[PDB]
Amino acid sequence: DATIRAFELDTIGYGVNYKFTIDQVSRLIYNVDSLPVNADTIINSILIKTLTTASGIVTMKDDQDSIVNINDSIDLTKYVNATEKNNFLVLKVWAPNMEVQNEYKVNIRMHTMVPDSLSWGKDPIANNPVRNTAEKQKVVTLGDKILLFAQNNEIYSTAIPAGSPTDRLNYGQKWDKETTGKLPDGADVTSIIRFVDKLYLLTKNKEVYNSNDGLTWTKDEVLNSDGVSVTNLITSFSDSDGSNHKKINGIAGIVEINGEKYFSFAEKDVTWEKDIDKLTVVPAEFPINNLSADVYATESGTLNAIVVGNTEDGLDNDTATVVWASEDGKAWIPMEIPSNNNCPKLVDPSIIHYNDAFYICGKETKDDAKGFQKFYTSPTLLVWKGVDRMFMLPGILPPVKSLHESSFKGKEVNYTMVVDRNHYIWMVGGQGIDKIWRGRVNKLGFLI
């Protein structure tokens, strides 16, 4: 005289079935994977099936104990998310001899917010603190702080809570002046670069400057060699960026040996390689200004780096934003695309690796759809698509019955962006936007 079970429910989406766990010790039923937000209109009248047990007589409390209509449809919208304001569908199952008695309580778990959706909120969370917002911008993260730099030796800051990206954190509403200020003479703020626990910077006169905390800056004695001259710092490779089986540690950049440009790599605490026989020459198509970079671990356990930026002012048969990759610091290689699957030409482009995909943003110059128009995405770095749906630019609101005044969409301004270690996207707008935007796709905050 048993109470064996196989409780099931039919297709909610076409061909989509949801699995239910059966806790017989604690006597309750629930689905581990929560139903989508769309489902509250579908489970309004839905059909149960495969409720097989040793003797099919089953009842639900109503005063009376009325028998279940196992062959008929039911409204389940009253029984969703029953853990608080607890309102389970509680039902009683009889043994074949009617001696053994049991009840089970059922909970239909459903999402309160769409999982794969980039949430920007209704409004930008803060104003841009920089005086004279025309000036060039740059944003970077260090330790537990986010730093925003401006060209006129001007620095602002905000701090991050204790940890655990899945916790109910709020931050960014307040920004402070780092009152000591005074980043070095002749600096170029758009060149600022991270390493394991230090920041590095480049001057117009091609000195390299560094800092441990961003408060104060000094020259360094290991990268400022004579004979060579630096012209760009691209990215840094480290154990902190991923899981590198190759064991790479250092900074990658460009040095102009004897008047010609070469890629070079400064390994941890030693000077750039300057041996002209075993450096490599920079191609004419390689980006020159406003570089952006990212470093990530391939599924093989090997680090990889990718960059985009502005090219030289004019060159033949160029119509697209090609991305350059590198398995180490010695030589960068272009991801050129023969087919039509290549993304448009962009001004001041930025690239990120995010939620197991790649994304690019920038402003277009075709005169019929100028400005930031959309993000562009890639699953495998060699084909690019425009996202016509969720994961939009900031300020693009859904119908509450719209475009927010401080939205990027359609604007043509200076900007900068970064991703922090809670996977918030931070986007900072210059003259014409004047605001700070913050967002994350909801799927990254879930405990699942």
Partner 1 sequence: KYDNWRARNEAFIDSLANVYATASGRGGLERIEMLTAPGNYIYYKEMEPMTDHVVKAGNPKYTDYVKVYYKGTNILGEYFDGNFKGDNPVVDGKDPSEGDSPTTIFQVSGVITGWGEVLQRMEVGDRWKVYIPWDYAYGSSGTTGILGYSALVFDITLLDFANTEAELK
Q: Give the interface with partner 1 as residue ranges (CB under 8 A).
A: 1-6, 19-25, 32, 100
Q: Is the alpha carbon torsion for 386, 392, 393, 398 positive or negative?
A: positive
- For CA atoms 155, 311, 314, 377, the dihedral sign is negative
Shorter beta-carbon distance to partner 1: residue 111 or 345? 111
Name which of 1 and 10 has its Cβ closer to partner 1. 1
Q: CA 268, CA 291: separation in Å to the nearest integer?
A: 22
Burial class, 346, CB count within 10 angstroms (exposed 0-12 / middle 13-18 / buried 19+): buried
Look at the block and give the residue holding tokens 């909801």: 442
| Shortest spacing between CB 114 and partner 1, in angstroms | 22
Minimal distance, residue 169 CB to partner 1, in Å:
25
Give the shortest CB-32-to-partner 1 separation in angstroms. Answer: 5
Contact (CB, 8 A) for 117 and 36? no
Q: Identify the burial level of 69 via C-beta atoms within 10 angstroms of its C-beta, where 0-12 means exposed, 13-18 middle and 19 or more buried.
A: exposed
Residue 104 or 263: which CB sits closer to partner 1?
A: 104
Comparing CB distances to partner 1, the nearer of 28 and 347 is 28
Q: Least distance (Å) from partner 1 to the CB of residue 102? A: 9
Smallest separation (angstroms) from partner 1 to the CB of 54? 8
Query: Smallest distance from the beta carbon of 299 to partner 1, in angstroms?
Result: 16
Which residue number, 5 or 206, has a Cβ lying nearer to partner 1?
A: 5
Look up residue 166 and give its two tokens: 């899945």
Question: In whole angstroms, how close is the CB of 1 to partner 1 at the nearest point?
Answer: 7
Which candidate, 325, 370, 379, places its Cα nearest to that of 346?
A: 370
When the beta carbons of 5 and 423 are compared against partner 1, the nearer one is: 5
Q: What is the DSSP string of 111-143?
A: -SS-SS-EE--SS-SEE---SSTTS-EEEEEET
- DSSP letter for 108, please: B
8 Å CB contact between 84 and 77? no
Torsion of CA 121, 125, 127, 128, to 10 degrees: -90
Residue 1 vs 144, nearer CB to partner 1: 1
Helix (H, G, I), strand (E, B) or coil at 375: coil
Question: Least distance to partner 1 from the beta carbon of 327, Å?
Answer: 30
Closer to partner 1 by CB, 20 or 120: give it.
20
